[PDB]
Amino acid sequence: MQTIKCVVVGDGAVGKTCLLISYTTNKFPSEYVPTVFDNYAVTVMIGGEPYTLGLFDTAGQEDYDRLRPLSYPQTDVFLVCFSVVSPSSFENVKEKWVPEITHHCPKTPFLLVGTQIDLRDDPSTIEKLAKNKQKPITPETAEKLARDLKAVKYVECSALTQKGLKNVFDEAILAALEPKSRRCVLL
């Protein structure tokens, strides 16, 4: 029964794990959100045939450059996450994440995923950014980076409200199957 291994990478504190938790559970937003996400399998149907989607977080690995790559073998698709309210996490997509995964997994597709889109409206986030003469990343600017970096595409979501959340993963699944060959190997 064929599998899709999907690995979520990106800077710390951009909501990688919140995203995975919110996609795979059905919590009220007031409930406690674990800091940790265990490897998760679920059956998804496409072309009327079952596939197992395997979801892997990389939380806490952001400063450990020799441990990170241990997660990469057998990957069929990467989600390269940044927060739309953290310009430094967006810069790192370009300086750090996309070069790393393309060095280790040169034929593996990746999506550019903007997280925390609800924080564009949050008074405190906006005030703290503006203190440093910054502001959130716009979808336009991110679409532009996705094209320059050869991401399959740019998708945006909020783990909190779930806006765009299921679509991130449907687009991941599609990128992974679009006509093993794309699967990361030995590096």
Partner: protein, 365 residues
């Protein structure tokens, strides 16, 4: 104020939530370890006609020793859990008293990609695919294959700092745990950083042999005879002896020894071996700005290397202040690394040298 935020749980409750997450993720983690050891390892050891000893050691490494450590770590956490008032639980000391035991994760991470290489090889063959799928069904594990499950110790050793940081954020400064949690956070960050750094060091042996092979006019022994880590490098002026000529050189600080080279005047990527300083014999004297006693020069951004037993002495000059400081750290750092290494008996293997040196004969001679 204005009250425009959404419902958040209070600080003590958040601490209780975190404590429960810690206990629960440790029990789920040990269940995965047990499922590996009982569902895969034990079944593989039974089939001697399908797995050699060496294949088992390569695929499973020390997973069983990690399971064993974790049984003890979990028993101790549970003893600290306060049933009456979970948020009052004090788990900082459990991490502190088990800290040396976490070092078994170094070996696990260093050998993981060999594990992945072997499994991928075996998974081409339907005999093993079916065997492994069978183990997974009987141990009742979710539908992630064995390679995923063998990644869990790696993810785990990287998750503790995060969990302890979240615990700290909800712990008041007067809690019986505050200073213990803060120290446990520091200790577990250091465990992981040191595992990452030991791994880098082992992976870069190859690079030290290759670098040495690219340097022209090499004299004396291979760097890997005495050293196994580049600590710092850059460009300084220096004077070998009082009244001597100031030469500009590129210095390479390894554990035990500092090599110096000269760049070619035209071809800036070409380096010429110019000698080396045995750092076991040299103390670092930090010299203060102004003017120097015979010696007899003037000085901006300067320090000195005295021989311990002799009157031998060398003057160094960085350009910026930023650079003098960076070098002084790199010297404390190489003394530090040397003490820890001889204390732990960290040798570099014989076949590790033979592997690194074989890579040089790949790019001709």
């Amino acid at each position: 104020c204005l009250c425009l935020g959404r419902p958040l749980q209070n600080r003590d409750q958040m601490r209780a939530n975190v404590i429960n997450e810690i206990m629960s993720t440790e029990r789920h983690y040990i269940k995965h370890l047990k499922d590996i050891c009982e569902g895969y390892l034990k079944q593989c050891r039974k089939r001697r006609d399908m797995f050699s000893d060496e294949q088992l050691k390569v695929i499973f490494g020390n997973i069983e020793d990690i399971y064993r450590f974790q049984m003890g770590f979990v028993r101790d956490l549970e003893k600290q859990y306060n049933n009456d008032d979970p948020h009052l639980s004090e788990i900082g000391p459990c991490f502190l008293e088990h800290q040396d035991g976490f070092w078994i994760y170094s070996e696990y991470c260093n050998n993981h990609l060999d594990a992945c290489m072997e499994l991928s090889k075996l998974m081409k063959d339907s005999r093993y695919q079916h065997f492994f799928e069978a183990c997974r069904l009987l141990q009742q594990m979710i539908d992630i294959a064995i390679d995923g499950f063998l990644l869990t110790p790696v993810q785990k050793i990287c998750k503790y700092p995060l969990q302890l940081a979240e615990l700290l954020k909800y712990t008041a400064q007067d809690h019986s745990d505050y200073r213990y949690v803060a120290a446990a956070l520091a200790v577990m960050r250091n465990v992981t950083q040191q595992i990452n750094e030991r791994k880098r060091r082992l992976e870069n042996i190859d690079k030290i042999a290759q670098w040495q092979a690219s340097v022209l006019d090499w004299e004396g022994d291979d760097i890997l005879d005495r050293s196994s880590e580049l600590i710092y490098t850059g460009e300084m002026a220096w004077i070998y002896q009082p009244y001597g000529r100031n030469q500009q050189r590129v210095f390479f600080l390894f554990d035990h020894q500092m090599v110096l080279c000269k760049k070619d005047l035209i071809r800036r990527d070409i380096l010429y071996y110019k000698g080396r300083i045995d750092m076991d014999k040299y103390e670092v004297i930090d010299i203060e700005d102004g003017r120097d006693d015979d010696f007899n020069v003037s000085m901006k951004n300067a320090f000195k290397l005295h021989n311990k037993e002799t009157e031998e002495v060398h003057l160094f000059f960085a350009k910026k202040l930023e650079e003098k400081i960076r070098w002084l750290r790199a010297f404390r750092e190489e003394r530090k690394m040397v003490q820890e290494d001889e204390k732990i008996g960290f040798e570099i293997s014989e076949n590790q040298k033979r592997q690194a040196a074989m890579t040089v004969r790949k790019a001709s001679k």
